[PDB]
Design a protein around this ligand. Structure first.
Ligand SMILES: Nc1nc2c(ncn2[C@@H]2O[C@H](COP(=O)(O)OP(=O)(O)O)[C@@H](O)[C@H]2O)c(=O)[nH]1
Length: 408
């Protein structure tokens, strides 16, 4: 009834590189006159190894396509006023006395900023309470609570943000870097419990473009309860309740009726990133794990022929085409066969001028694969986990790869 590992057999040797790039995210930074935007930005580029001290200092004085990286993502900074939409919107608010307060008055532009965000499609606003080090504020839990509560009422009032479930507040010092890359030390701020800014940014689940994409949730387990329970990780989009999903590749319709979190509570909705357990009405006689629950308008793709970069780990090593094993792309489990060894690879992913007649261990290649049955997938590029597979020679492992192109 269930799936042990969602090709989490991808463990062993960190060669997961060049072929499994980091997640491309689009972040924008919003804030007042001297809120700290430029310093915050610069310090992140430096603290995160993108730039040197001089460059840092250069950038910051001249602000008066860049990008940074965390463990699992690459963030591309966008201007203030497809890859045009922000995934994340960071409002930078100064915690200094006089500056903070200035914002919420005739002169100040904070209400404008909340509306700007809203217009830009930011429904999960990240609010950074900057300058917690500045003498007028020295990491006082009271100053922090003062700012956060004013912002709570304010943002709900002028732009509808519900601070309990929409806005994430965070204290930082853009100048000293405290709570930017690394959490603030207890000796400096005994009270803060959460993560640093980049920690949150690296793990944070609500990415606008992805939340707004079509729904995709590979079925990881089918089992009974008050009826059938399809369940897995939502990989894109969002799911409501008493709303119809499509089952691919079979193209059969169904209706969600309950959503249960990892603590089995009947919620009304979840988004991408969440690990949920659904329940549905409809003929699920042909439904099985591996298949993908998706939007009825732009459903996930399914094909039988596609292209893909691969890397052999330890197979007996030989012959082009043919070779049949067991692919795993997200929970599907499917007999796949080589069908046109097109290019080889090496060191600095070049390509290949002499299409091999076969492959071997320690040889990464690209080739047209084939399945008798169609399997749901997408380009890693577009939906990483929907294009991340591992091959398996009848028991043992063999290779691992990503899909690059869908062939009709
Ligand atoms: N005390 C202190 N000063 C800061 C901090 N962050 C920014 N500032 C100062 O506040 C001013 C804001 O300018 P900037 O950092 O460029 O913010 P921007 O004008 O929005 O780009 C600068 O003079 C910074 O030195 C901080 O965390 N602590």
């Amino acid at each position: 009834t269930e799936d042990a590992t969602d090709l989490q057999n991808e463990v062993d040797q960190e060669l997961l590189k060049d072929m499994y790039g980091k997640e491309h995210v689009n972040i924008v930074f919003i804030g007042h006159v001297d809120a700290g935007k430029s310093t915050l930005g610069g310090n992140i580029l430096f603290l995160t190894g993108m730039v040197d001290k001089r460059t840092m200092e250069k950038i910051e004085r001249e602000a008066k396509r860049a990008y940074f990286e965390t463990e699992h993502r690459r963030f591309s900074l966008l201007d203030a006023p497809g890859a045009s939409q922000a995934d994340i919107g960071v409002l930078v608010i100064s915690a200094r006395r006089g500056e903070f307060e200035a914002g919420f008055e005739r002169g100040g532009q904070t209400r404008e900023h909340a509306v700007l965000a809203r217009t830009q499609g930011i429904n999960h606003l990240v609010v950074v309470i900057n300058k917690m080090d500045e003498p007028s504020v020295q990491w006082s839990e009271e100053r922090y609570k003062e700012c956060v509560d004013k912002l709570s009422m304010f943002l709900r009032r002028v732009a509808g943000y519900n601070s309990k479930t929409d806005v994430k507040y965070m204290p930082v010092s853009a100048y000293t870097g405290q709570n930017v890359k690394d959490r603030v030390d207890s000796s400096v701020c005994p009270w803060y419990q959460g993560p640093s800014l980049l920690e949150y940014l690296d793990s944070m689940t609500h990415l606008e473009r992805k939340v707004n994409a079509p729904f995709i949730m590979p079925i990881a387990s089918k089992y009974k309860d008050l009826g059938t329970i399809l369940e897995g990780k939502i990989e894109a989009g969002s799911i409501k309740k008493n709303s119809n999903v499509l089952v691919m590749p079979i193209n059969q319709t169904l209706e969600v009726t309950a959503i249960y979190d990892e603590a089995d509570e009947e919620i009304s909705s979840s988004i991408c990133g969440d690990q949920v357990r659904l329940r549905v009405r409809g003929d699920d006689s042909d439904v099985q794990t591996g298949y993908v629950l998706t939007s009825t308008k732009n459903p996930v793709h399914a094909t039988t022929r596609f292209i893909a970069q691969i890397a052999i780990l330890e197979l007996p090593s030989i012959l082009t085409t043919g070779y049949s094993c067991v692919m795993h792309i997200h929970t599907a489990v499917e007999e796949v066969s080589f069908a046109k060894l097109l290019h080889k690879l090496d060191k600095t992913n070049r390509k290949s001028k002499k299409p091999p007649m076969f492959a071997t261990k320690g040889m990464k290649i690209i080739a047209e694969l084939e399945t008798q049955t169609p399997v749901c997938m997408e380009r890693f590029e577009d939906y990483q986990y929907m294009g991340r597979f591992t091959l398996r020679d009848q028991g043992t492992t063999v290779a691992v790869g990503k899909v690059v192109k869908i062939l009709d």
